[PDB]
């Protein structure tokens, strides 16, 4: 049996799709499951053990010229999928794109009332509202429709497969991680800092207002007491996922020895070679919490129940600090450094 996923969005709303893929490969064993996503999102599928090969068609534009449209259909259809499960909240136009792919079981999401509520007759199992806010709840409908719906298959087959369990190929684990690490200070005993500025870092597609960045002054105040003490004594990794050659010249986290790297969504290995991580609500949170990798998440407030379900990851290792004011760029940075100084 062949399966195709049409997950939409960038990185943070695509890295959370691994549970669904694992549940697929667990319920129906020996299933070739391919995926189509956006250019920025396909980058995530270079660290997995289920998908056959990814692709890139839909940032889900409005016009896209009617030859790149057909050819896309002309490559979905001519491999004979069976259940093309989808996302992106199909209305009545995008439902036809699933329908023309002559599979057997078309399951997806739909708009509640807005954008031509619709949902069409030519579908199956259309469900809950659109904007897809919460994380690790996420596709929450999917981890129920694929659970024991049919037959003597055991009672719900391991309800929500273990949380993100991304693997790292030892080739990428060694060569590129080492080369970028040792470019500058490196001991495998440092600390990653992610939220800096706003070009395309992860942006989370859902946080909206906070977690996009900090004013880089709080980061300097944190970092000046990070390496202070023989705990790490290595870590000055401001880790700017930006055009930071446009930013490195303004690291007021004084440029004396604050190192820096450019990365795609490959930084999972760089996390796995750190001695921790401290960042705002971003892909780094889920990536660090996937492995042991004791993390420190700093998002706005009380969004934990949306973006961070496994409050106790391993030993309540990953700890979260909120902001009583609600805006991320105000926090008890003193207590933040207090919590961070232990790891």
């Amino acid at each position: 049996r062949r399966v195709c996923c049409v997950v939409s969005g960038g990185v943070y709303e695509n890295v959370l799709f691994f549970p669904v893929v694992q549940m697929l490969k667990d319920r129906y064993p020996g299933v070739l499951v391919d995926v189509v996503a956006s250019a920025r999102g396909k980058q995530v599928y270079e660290m997995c053990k289920n998908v056959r090969y990814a692709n890139v068609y839909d940032p889900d534009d409005e016009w896209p010229e009617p030859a790149e449209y057909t050819h896309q259909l002309g490559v979905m259809k001519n491999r004979y999928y069976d259940m093309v499960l989808s996302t992106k909240l199909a209305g009545t136009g995008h439902a036809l794109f699933l329908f023309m792919s002559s599979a057997r079981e078309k399951v997806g999401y739909v708009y509640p009332n807005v954008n031509g509520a619709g949902a069409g007759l030519f579908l199956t199992e259309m469900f809950k509202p659109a904007t897809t806010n919460l994380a690790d709840g996420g596709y929450n409908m999917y981890q129920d429709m694929l659970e024991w719906l049919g037959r003597p298959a055991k009672g719900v087959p391991q309800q929500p497969i273990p949380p993100l369990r991304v693997s790292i190929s030892k080739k990428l684990r060694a060569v590129v991680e080492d080369k970028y690490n040792r470019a500058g200070v490196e001991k495998g005993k440092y600390v990653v800092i992610h939220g800096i500025e706003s070009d395309s870092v992860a942006n989370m597609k859902s946080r909206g207002d906070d977690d996009c960045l900090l004013p880089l002054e709080l980061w300097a105040e944190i970092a000046k007491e990070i390496s202070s003490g023989g705990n790490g004594l290595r870590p000055l990794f401001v880790m700017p996922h930006e055009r930071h050659r446009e930013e490195i010249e303004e690291i007021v986290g004084e440029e004396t020895a604050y190192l820096f790297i450019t990365t795609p969504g490959q930084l999972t290995c760089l996390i796995n070679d750190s001695a921790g991580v401290v960042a705002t609500n971003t892909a780094a949170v889920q990536l660090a919490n996937a492995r042991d990798k004791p993390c420190v998440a700093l998002f706005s407030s009380k969004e934990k129940a949306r973006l961070f379900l496994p409050y106790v990851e391993e030993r309540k290792s990953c700890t979260v600090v909120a902001s009583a004011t609600g805006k991320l760029a105000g926090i008890d940075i003193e207590a933040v450094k207090k919590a961070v100084k232990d790891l």
């Binding site: 270079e46 660290m47 053990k49 289920n50 998908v51 693997s167 030892k170």
Partner: protein, 82 residues
């Protein structure tokens, strides 16, 4: 011939003649039957199409072989099984 035009502002006179290859349009095609000499300049060595920095011989093979990524995901699954 050598007609002598007395134009109204200068001192011309001309002389012309008509010429055309009679039938040697056959002989030149016969000489351009030197494409039967396209065999000495083909048995010569190939520049790099036989070089060690080349493997894959289609029109998109070397360029779009590019799916050792799937095999690498499978090797990742196998290493996880180990």
């Amino acid at each position: 011939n050598q007609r002598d035009w007395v134009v109204t502002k200068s001192i011309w006179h001309l002389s012309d003649t008509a010429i055309k290859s009679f039938y040697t349009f056959y002989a030149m095609f016969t000489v351009w039957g030197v494409c039967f000499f396209a065999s000495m300049k083909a048995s010569m060595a190939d520049p790099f199409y036989d070089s060690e920095h080349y493997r894959g011989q289609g029109g998109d093979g070397t360029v779009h072989w590019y799916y050792d990524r799937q095999e690498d995901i499978e090797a990742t699954a196998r290493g996880d099984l180990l």
